[PDB]
Amino acid sequence: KKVCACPKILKPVCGSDGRTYANSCIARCNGVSIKSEGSCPTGI
Hints:
20% strand; 3 strands; serine-type endopeptidase inhibitor activity; alpha+beta; monomer; three-stranded antiparallel sheet; 1 helix
């Protein structure tokens, strides 16, 4: 449970794996880059 200290702000991003996280602060700390802003689609 050693989660990064990030803010409550709803600013999600699409990770390079295709996952969605809270914001850039958590996404970067998880060891991944971002491909775009907003949540990523599940694959329609």
